[PDB]
Amino acid sequence: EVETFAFQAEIAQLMSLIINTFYSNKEIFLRELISNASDALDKIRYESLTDPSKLDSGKELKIDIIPNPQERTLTLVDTGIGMTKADLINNLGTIAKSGTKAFMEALQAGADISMIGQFGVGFYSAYLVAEKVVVITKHNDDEQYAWESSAGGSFTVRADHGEPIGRGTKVILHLKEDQTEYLEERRVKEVVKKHSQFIGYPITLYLEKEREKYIDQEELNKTKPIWTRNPDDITQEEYGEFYKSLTNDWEDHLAVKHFSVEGQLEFRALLFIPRRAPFDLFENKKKKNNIKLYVRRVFIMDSCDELIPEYLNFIRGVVDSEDLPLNISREMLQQSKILKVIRKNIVKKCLELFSELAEDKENYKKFYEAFSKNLKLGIHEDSTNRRRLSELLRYHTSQSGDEMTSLSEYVSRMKETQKSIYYITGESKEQVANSAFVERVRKRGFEVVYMTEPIDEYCVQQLKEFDGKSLVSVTKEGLELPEDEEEKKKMEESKAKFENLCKLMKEILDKKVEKVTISNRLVSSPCCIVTSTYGWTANMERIMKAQALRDNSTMGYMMAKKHLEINPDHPIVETLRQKAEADKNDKAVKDLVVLLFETALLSSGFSLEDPQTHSNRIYRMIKLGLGID
Amino acid sequence: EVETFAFQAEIAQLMSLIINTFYSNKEIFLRELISNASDALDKIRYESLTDPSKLDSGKELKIDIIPNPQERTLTLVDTGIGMTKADLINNLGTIAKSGTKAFMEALQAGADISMIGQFGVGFYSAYLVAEKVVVITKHNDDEQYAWESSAGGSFTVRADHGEPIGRGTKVILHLKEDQTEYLEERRVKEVVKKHSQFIGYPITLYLEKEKYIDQEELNKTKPIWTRNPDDITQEEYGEFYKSLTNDWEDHLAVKHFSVEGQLEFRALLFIPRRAPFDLFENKKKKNNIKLYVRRVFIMDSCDELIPEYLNFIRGVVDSEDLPLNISREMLQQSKILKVIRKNIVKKCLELFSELAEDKENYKKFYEAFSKNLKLGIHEDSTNRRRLSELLRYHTSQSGDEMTSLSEYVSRMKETQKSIYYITGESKEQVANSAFVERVRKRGFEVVYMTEPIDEYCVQQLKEFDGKSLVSVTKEGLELPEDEEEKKKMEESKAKFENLCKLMKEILDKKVEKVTISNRLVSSPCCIVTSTYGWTANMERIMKAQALRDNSTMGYMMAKKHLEINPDHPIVETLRQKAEADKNDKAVKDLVVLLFETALLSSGFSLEDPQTHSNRIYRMIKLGLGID
Amino acid sequence: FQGSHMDVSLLLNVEGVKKTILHGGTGELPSFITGSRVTFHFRTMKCDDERTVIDDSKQVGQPMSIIIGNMFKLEVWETLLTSMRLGEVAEFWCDTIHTGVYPMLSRSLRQVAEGKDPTSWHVHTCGLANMFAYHTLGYEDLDELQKEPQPLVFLIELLQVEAPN
Ligand SMILES: Nc1ncnc2c1ncn2[C@@H]1O[C@H](COP(=O)(O)OP(=O)(O)NP(=O)(O)O)[C@@H](O)[C@H]1O
Ligand SMILES: Nc1ncnc2c1ncn2[C@@H]1O[C@H](COP(=O)(O)OP(=O)(O)NP(=O)(O)O)[C@@H](O)[C@H]1O
Ligand SMILES: [Mg+2]
């Protein structure tokens, strides 16, 4: 009726599958072998706690790498626990059987061990490069054995009688001719630096050189992983040394945030703010290499926008975790929601770190000068954390002076009757300061925030209001200052009087300015060009007309509707009104109106549709002035 | 002495690793299941070639999907070859043992059927979702057999004696509580459309809806790339393109080719008629070129199969044999990706070259993707010499239409030795610009380039056809000269050197060198960029970059040179006044105003335009006398 | 070099209709005054994931055209066409509110070139009487929409706007 069975596995095809499909890059074999070796040491160290006599065979815990180009053999020696003959047959012989996992589960309660091994297929990755693997073992209990294989579905166990090892395991890989580049010292050093840099135990690279045919020993893991240590005990010198070792930069770290989060997702993070912004900080193009992720002191992956937002890529550091669902190739994870939670915690702690750092005035000035572009990019993109990022903003204001002030200081100095934050954007502090738009506002004693970088436009694209106060761009129309009764009476009288002049100027510059009227934001300049309420600001339109990859047709979708704003109290405007009343039409008045519009367009930041015409008009005006004839 | 052994495997641990570690995304189980099924059909179809009597059990080959939320069971029925009890034990019950590979290798010579199941571990991916699997098979040779398992290291084989299934296999998955989202029609349809859209055989989805069972054909777009390109008409290509891209418009051009050898793959690329609106805002680095292996989706290209600038091409690349990850998501060797990129770029350039004959179709394609072409010229250094022939530009003698550089070289004067070009933010400004005023008088054709990307394009395009590109904006322009012209120029320099040094004294820290000019036929003066530094338009573009270091800009900023026109009356009057008055407020103010106007007209921004506007207002007042 | 290629802004003030811009358009906003003639390809599909085509102007080859006047065929179309720039392929995701009058207009647009002229209004009244009392048209679009109303998606490719008259 019902005949139960048990699953089987074709061993040869399974081995071929492991060799060919599991691992993409073949350079990871060391990362695996060392990892095993690491656990091999950990066990004996634990067994040293309850039995020091078991270390009588050897008192030194180290890993040695010996390349031998004479025989093309890569040797890896460790004075670890070693494996018995039974251990050789079971743990190494059986695929997917992890003796390390069995040792870990056999432990008692909670103890300070973090064995890397979890799967049981790491060792066979050695066949990615080698064509023959020999493992010479000497456990502290039984005799020395030799295990030889070539991934041919069978392995040989022999009673070894060569040079005694005392204790531990020595693996010899007879590399194939194709993968001979790993006998070079430089390749081995690069691989060790990339993958096995933070392993706790000392690892050295024995080599043979001449000076006269001496043996050179070099340690490749002098730097120790400090994130395991308690953050309070660590000193700033240790942080600086770690930063220099990690980034290979002479300069120290500007600030460091070291925090651990426990619970269902426990991990320790160590973040550094670089002292100097890189020259090529942008243009990474998926080459983030910012926050290297580690699991039990083994590198996994670079944060390709998974762990960190794009704008926060200037921050360096490491994240380490103990328990984490890991891929078969140990180069990625299984769940992205875990990465999202990591990102949430990292962003929260980064904002907390920035708030803490904001107290140091000079250090915060340096940090702002270094990464204000990144902060404003974050304001543009990160929507949930907009208040916190906004509080981290420093600006040059009219009343600030040379030094920069926060928006909170502006609110503190903000007037009692004022109900908005008046900002003006431009390409320079000097040009903005002398601009016509802020003449009236500064005349009335209202502080104005100068935003003198192109990315500032994006900053105001998203930041609509701050602390319950709305941001108002001086350039944009509808600027309504608090006005008295007499000011309103004067405004009404001027609007009544200059109606004919406004109509005439609208007629003259048809299809060039949507609306021509008087204004309350000009005190010395005759006229100004004002962006409409909906379209791109003048500076914004100028900026986004210069994008390298832009659609010309798309430009026409959000073009600004130009408005002309004249000053009724300017002598030029009164003379123009008088002349226009004298003559309903004349060449001189039309030329003056065109020239005034051209000058306002130039001063407002708009590029001329044809500067040659305006230049020629100026040339003719100069000729008339000096009377060359 | 020596004691050899044989490798073993821990079945429970291996199964746990396969279930938990092999596959990151749990939704791909269908992609695996369906795929197997396909082969079961393919096999029998092959066995129908030499034995039609083997189809007497069932004359129809189809795949049916039946979700049942009442019992929370997902059923997949196929009228394939089926498996015997021996086949059940040998293939399903053994991991890493694939019957598909054994069947494929037993074929005589080279047949025409390619199956996907090399690895043979795919089936177990069903346990990503199901907590129980029941496979009801009925091979023609042997009785019905039910195969029940729960990935617990054991499975049960049972005589079925249930309702007949004709011939084939029916796999029923008892979904676990968490993964109940796969009973919805939308999720199943989306998964099938994403992964197994191009399965050759018909895939039918069953459902219950008045209150009548319904069947919906999930796959309708036949894979045309397998068919011979000569047989396919244009209507079929357009229909396939519309189905692939969900676009109301049809394709503009199609390139269907195949490369065979050590790397065998066939590709089908489409140039659309109209460019996308703002795809650059989104990432859009994917969903452009989709890679298929044996007619199943593998990965979405992003800078690997195609460069960034050709991401507008929409197409498919299909290869019969490629090394694959165990996850069936990504490839193993990136060098193969490099080879694919090289071949695709070569074929795309060939496609553009052969398309260039159609004048109107070219004009449209260029209007759509000139930005992409120029970005590729900026990036792809190896293909600059071939990409440059695809450029179309507006010249002084061209008019509205655009001409290639080859036409310019053909029309180039025999004396003429270089291609003169000028960049600006508009065609009208460039046409009326001061710099090109003299050249057009001498008859030399000038190339207008009026897009921001043009500066990047000419940063790399140093020369063409052995003729160098010369920026009219840049200093050192030297047209062929007559002896009389050289004498006149030298005499004018000897006459005006005094005014030149006086202006240099007046314009301290503003202009590096003040000289007479050869390019200014009428304008009073002009500001000309130095030899090595950034040009005015390029400097403005770099100043307008959102993400660029400000402190570094001054290193690449050029040094302005003033060029004066000896024959303009204003310059002669200024020279006469300077000779009459060595120092004077009026002459210095005039020279400052002239420099400001030249800076504005050349294209440079102004450090303080408010001062210039105020000076204009003051001189207007003085003109009109309003004081 | 810059990933960002767009900036959020306001548009499409009226509720019940979602707007997306599939492709760009050359020129400024077209002159939209009463009496102007508008020529515009249109396509109407289902909002569902299938997006099956209901009405397509491309297969017919005759771009439907209207005048800027009080034809009151459908107010939302009269607004969308006005709120459009020339040469602009666009997508509009309306809702079930506006698309109540659609089925009769779809029948008229399918039968305008099928052999029925819009110059008669008594035949439509006879059809309404038949629907109310006698029988049913049985057209697929009528059954799909009148019996069950859903939001719709409209692809609009306006060709040009002429001077009035
Ligand atoms: N140097 C060594 N000393 C002692 N035992 C070792 C050594 N190297 C490997 N082993 C044994 O090899 C077994 C399996 O090797 P391995 O491939 O690392 O599986 P693992 O323990 O899961 N490590 P990993 O595959 O990276 O997860 C371990 O359980 C160890 O008992
Ligand atoms: N529905 C089926 N009908 C017939 N034979 C099947 C069916 N499913 C599986 N088999 C056989 O059982 C083997 C194991 O299945 P499977 O694990 O899916 O490998 P595969 O079908 O070859 N595809 P893959 O595992 O990705 O290599 C297959 O190779 C076939 O020989
Ligand atoms: Mg291991």
Ligand SMILES: [Mg+2]
């Ligand atoms: Mg499979």
